[PDB]
Amino acid sequence: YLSQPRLTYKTVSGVNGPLVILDHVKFPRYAEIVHLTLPDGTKRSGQVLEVSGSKAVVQVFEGTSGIDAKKTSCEFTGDILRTPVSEDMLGRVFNGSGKPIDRGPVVLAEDFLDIMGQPINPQCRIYPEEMIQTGISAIDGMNSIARGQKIPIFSAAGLPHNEIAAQICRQAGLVKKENFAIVFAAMGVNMETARFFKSDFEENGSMDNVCLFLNLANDPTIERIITPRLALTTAEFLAYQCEKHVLVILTDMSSYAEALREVSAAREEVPGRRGFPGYMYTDLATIYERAGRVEGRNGSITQIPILTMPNDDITHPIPDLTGYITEGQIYVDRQLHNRQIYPPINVLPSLSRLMKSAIGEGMTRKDHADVSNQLYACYAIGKDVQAMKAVVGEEALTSDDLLYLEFLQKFERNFIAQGPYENRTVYETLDIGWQLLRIFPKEMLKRIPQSTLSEFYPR
Amino acid sequence: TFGYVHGVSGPVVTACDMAGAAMYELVRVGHSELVGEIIRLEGDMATIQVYEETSGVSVGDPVLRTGKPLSVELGPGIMGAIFDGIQRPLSDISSQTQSIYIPRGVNVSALSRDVKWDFTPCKNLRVGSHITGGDIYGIVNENSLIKHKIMLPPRNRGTVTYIAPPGNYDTSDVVLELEFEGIKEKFSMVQVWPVRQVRPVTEKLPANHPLLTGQRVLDALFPCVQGGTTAIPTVISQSLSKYSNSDVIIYVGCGERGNEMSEVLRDFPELTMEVDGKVESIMKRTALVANTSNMPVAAREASIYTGITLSEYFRDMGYHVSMMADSTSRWAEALREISGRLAEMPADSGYPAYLGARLASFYERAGRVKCLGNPEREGSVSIVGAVSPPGGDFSDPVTSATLGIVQVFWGLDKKLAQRKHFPSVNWLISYSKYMRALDEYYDKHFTEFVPLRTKAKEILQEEEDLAEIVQLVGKASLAETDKITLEVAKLIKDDFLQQNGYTPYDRFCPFYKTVGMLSNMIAFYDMARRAVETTAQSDNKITWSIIREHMGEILYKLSSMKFKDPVKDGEAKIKADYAQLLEDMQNAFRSLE
Amino acid sequence: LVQTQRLKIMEYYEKKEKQIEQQKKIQMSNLMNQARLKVLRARDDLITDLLNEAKQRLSKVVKDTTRYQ
Amino acid sequence: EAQMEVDQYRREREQEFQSKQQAAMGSQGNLSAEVEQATRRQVQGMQSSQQRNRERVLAQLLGMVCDVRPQVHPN
User: Fold this and answer.
1) DSSP for residue A416
2) What angle (nearest 5°) sits at the alpha carbon of residue B260, between those of residues B81 and B361?
3) Which residues in chain B have their CB less than 8 angstroms from residue A419's CB?
4) Three-state DSSP class for residue A447
């Protein structure tokens, strides 16, 4: 392996922003990690950015504020950035660089994996088959998530997408009729939501499932770019070598791309469309496409990215490319958060493109296809009656448009409304979903075929 | 120690013979000693950016090397002083030069080297006590309110072999001589800390106590906490300077106009506060950072870091500081022009790529801490930013990259200003994410308020999705449960979220009177709803228009709650009036049914 | 209505009883959390002392000369 | 008569409000003390397997440290 001793240069040729450029380097690698030690003693870390003959451009992680070109010693490693993975890191809280912050010890490695990762062979993938049960009714009843799906949650600043992400992590599991884990990556969080995540998951008793990667907002913007790659290499050890089912939640992927745009422009690159890098499509794809089931192993990786659309724009290139690689969306809505509904998940625009394979007999239950699209039709027909009632009044609505406004007062306050600690299992999000479909008679339910109307309506 | 100017090119100076020059360390460029900052080394040359005007700086000028970056002077003499963005005391350059101008290359001490302060040691140290970074060893009576505590610098420890006798001292003499192992050193009464370094702490406690702002809106519906961060996109900032629960105010204007900065310096030494029955000038517990747009652009970006480093210093004594950072969008316009001088690639509309990194490196220095030192202290720093977008949007990179960082948004609009409403509260885009942290203060001390706050935000929301049809169709064929949530909802929007700041009833709003007004208004809403839903089918079905004519005298007492003076009247003179009115609201409905 | 004035008090004491039972599981979770950490530190101490024995057995070779030259 | 359901019926569900108050005193003594027995049993399973593999891996370590091999970088 790497048994030769390491060279420790003090031949710094210049500092220019976050870049330290050395010279007379003996065979420098690309993307190799170095360890700079300052004059006073502060050890900083950095990654080699460009080599050219006897040169090396080093991008220091923690900035260059105090580096001189006379007394700074820059010890090279000779190997690229790798993570130590273990199965006993399920239950720890690491930061963006992979150091523990829960007063824990350093993780004893079972492997040292390169965090950039190799792609999966497209022949060796299987189509996603079973259900991941979250516990939130609005994304399990009508927007069900397969095993291996990549389905982002679309929201905005101020909306409670961070408590939806914390409620998924507390209650995610299988669809019971020993191999489940959650890798929660938090990029660009502040402190008061970092101690929301660190405190909620550790005293709601399910810290043992989750491996928490908390990358703060005041931490360096290069450490936000290796945070989802530390979280997905841990998930690819835990799933494709230990046969667990892993759910990978990446919180605020629009804050990854604001740290990628910052790292790109500080690499002296020229920006592309809307200022974002031109390689932004194949940079998110190296993150998102680390998913799916595999052939010959019993694990899987299902991803839930989370986005923050600026000014509720959908043509912004962070939601544009996420909707270009990932399969569907969830659409946390603002007009439901003002009306005090938790979780404020809109149903009408939301979609899971693999929902028709995660449902059915022997996966969830036999009527999960016919219930969901029936509640989807009656939610749309009510919301037309909801606006129409204001135009003509109550005395002008018949006994048809009152069944849809009386259903609509109970679909938002019983199906959508959950409360943050109420784990509705998927067998209980259908019995909720049926006792709203009994407000209508069997002569009105058009989306349900008659064979399961005979088996599930009369109770 | 000596450089030479090799070539100037605008505000960027290239110096030679600078071999061991650190990045961001301070230099004194020229024969007039212009303060600079080393921003780029290339071998033994050093590209310097000058914090002043560069006209007349020839080549071959001496460049002094200091060894310390841009740093502030912390010590007694700060409270009341009017500083600059690089801490140049403007009330003393106006004396030592006797002019109206700031000449180039002035070197005035930021703290006065002539005022004698009464030192008082912490009475538990001795010649031979162990003391580490943060332990209080002195107390200075700065003025009547502030107990200025002298503290050890962080990363400094040892055993005291000289403590200064209690008496009167200037800020130059050697008050403390402790020794580390082998080497003796000397401490003065002032300390120097770099403005881009975070002042260290022990641990960061959760922000769980409410920042009492003096108003009725922004303290019930969108609360802020002690240790929180807000955004206001002067009646909200002047109100916190007199009445709130903060012991040090720090006002930092980054690039504000000249006549609107000469307005504040005229007004604050006239303001008074009420402490113990005595009146006191509020300029005993505040320090301003004055900075206009004529000033250097390098001293406008550094005004934010000087302002929070001053804010963090008075935290460590144990006070709860509240920093108001006026015109954050002017500060970002200082980051745009520094980045253009470096030929740095812009990301978004000319702003640098690190606009969010610099803002999160400022907003995340706020919060309640467990202070570094021995006597187990606890202080906090509240930061109140003020974005000024180019006409009220969330499209610019400064307003949208603040709302990804802060927790409170006190969102104001321009359309909702000509109503003479005053504030211009929007209550649709304004949020507060300190509702989960405050579920313990409200449930323990007030035990009733969260369900009223849940309802009162909803009544003002159901009015919005009605009001588009109320304009177009116009109240013709409407349900009668909606006429409640347009007349009770109107009663909130003129008697609960309505203010006027110069009046003897609406300059302070105590919180027990604030929950006392909403305790009646929500009860009138639910009793109007319970009346109209149980009398919807039986016999003698009513509308709203039979109640408001019958109960017109009830709607006067429910409208004369905002006009009861919280200042002349007693503390319990106001809750009994709101508890006697409830029985004029429980019996009054029983006169119709 | 005599039924009704039980439940408005019962809801004030089903709510308190859903509260402490949540407070019971916080104590059991905060102790199972430091259980895995205290046993992960007793795996780290055995490693950092195995290297202390490899630091002392390393200095039993520098006393030698035919095995150190 | 139904207005007398205010001050007497509240002491009926107070036998449930006191039911967890003593059940806050029962599970407390076995909470910390029983898991502390498991955080001592899990440690003795480490040190039992520490001594059976210590001199094995000390020889592979010190044997690999005292390796002379002076390889060069390619050219």
Assistant:
1) I
2) 65
3) none
4) coil
Chain A interface includes C29 (CB < 8 A): yes
Q: Is B559 left (phi over 0), alpha (psi -120 to 50) or beta?
A: alpha
Q: Where are the beta strands (DSSP E) in B94-221?
A: 119-121, 130-131, 136-141, 147-151, 158-163, 176-179, 191-194
Residues of C in contact with D38 (CB under 8 A): 35
Residue B345 contacts residue A268 (beta carbons within 8 Å): yes
* CA nearest neighbour of B45 among B79, B11, B20, B9: B20
Q: Report CB contact under 8 Å: A106, C44.
A: yes
Q: Do D67 and A3 touch (CB under 8 A)?
A: yes
Beta bridge partners of A189: A216
H or E element, residue A195: helix A191-203
List the domain boundaries for chain A: 1-459
Query: φ, ψ for residue A49 (rounded to 5)?
Result: -100, -35
> Counting runs of H as helices and runs of E as strands, what totals does chain D give?
3, 0
* Phi, psi for residue B68 in degrees, rounded to 5: -130, 135
DSSP class per residue in B469-486: HHHHT-SSS--TTTTHHH
3-state secondary structure A110-162: CEEEECCCCCCCHHHEECCCCEEECCCHHHHCCCCEECCCECCEEECCCCCHH
Q: Is residue B40 less than 8 Å (CB to CB) from chain A?
A: yes
Alpha-carbon distance of A442 to A331, in angstroms, equals 31
Cβ of residue A419 closer than 8 Å to a chain C Cβ: no
**B152 with B89: CB under 8 angstroms?**
no
Chain A environment of B44 (Cβ under 8 Å): 69
Spatial contact of B578 and B519, defined as CB atoms under 8 Å apart: yes
For A64-96, b/e burial (b = at least 16 CB within 10 A) is bbbbbbeebebebbeeebbbbbeeebbbbbbbb
Per-position b or e across A334-367, b if 16+ CB within 10 A of its CB = bebbbbebbbbbbbeebebebbebbbeeebbbbb
> Resolution to 1 decimal, in Å?
3.7
Would you call B108 exposed, middle or buried from its count of C-beta atoms within 10 A (0-12, 13-18, 19+)? middle
Which residue from C minimizes the CA distance to A201? Answer: C29
CA–CA separation, A59 and A22 (whole Å): 11
Note if the bond before B11 is cis, omega within 30 degrees: no
Q: How far apart are the C-alpha atoms of A133 and A131, rounded to whole Å?
A: 6
Token pair of B171 as six digits: 């800020």
Question: Distance (Å, rounded) from C-alpha A341 to C-alpha A334?
Answer: 10
Please give the helix or strand (H or E) that residue A62 lies within, else none: none
Give the position of tokens 């961060």: B229
**Can you say whether residue A360 is alpha, beta or left, with left for phi > 0 and alpha for psi between -120 and 50 degrees?**
left
Q: Is residue A447 annotated as involved in ligand binding?
A: no
Q: Which residue of D has its CA nearest to A27?
A: D73
In angstroms, rounded to a whole number, what is the distance separating the alpha carbons of residues A211 and A236? Answer: 13
Do residues B76 and B140 make contact, with C-beta atoms less than 8 angstroms apart?
yes
Backbone region of residue B423 per phi and psi (left: phi > 0; alpha: psi in -120 to 50; beta: other values): beta
Q: Which of B14, B16, B23, B230 is the best mutation test for A, with the most CBs of A within 10 A?
A: B23
CB A208 within 8 A of CB A77: no
Location of structure tokens 């290339």: B42
Phi, psi dihedral angles at B9 (to 5 degrees): -150, 90
Phi, psi of A77 (to 5 degrees): -95, -50
State how far the Cα of B220 lies from the Cα of B518, in Å rounded to an integer.
Answer: 9
Q: Which of A378, A367, A384 is nearest to A445 (CA)?
A: A378
Residue in B548, B532, B528 with CA at minimum distance from that of residue B540: B532
Look up tokens 């609201």; give the residue.
B585
Backbone angles phi, psi at A365, to 5 degrees: 180, 165
Whether D73 sits inside 8 A of A27 (CB atoms) is yes
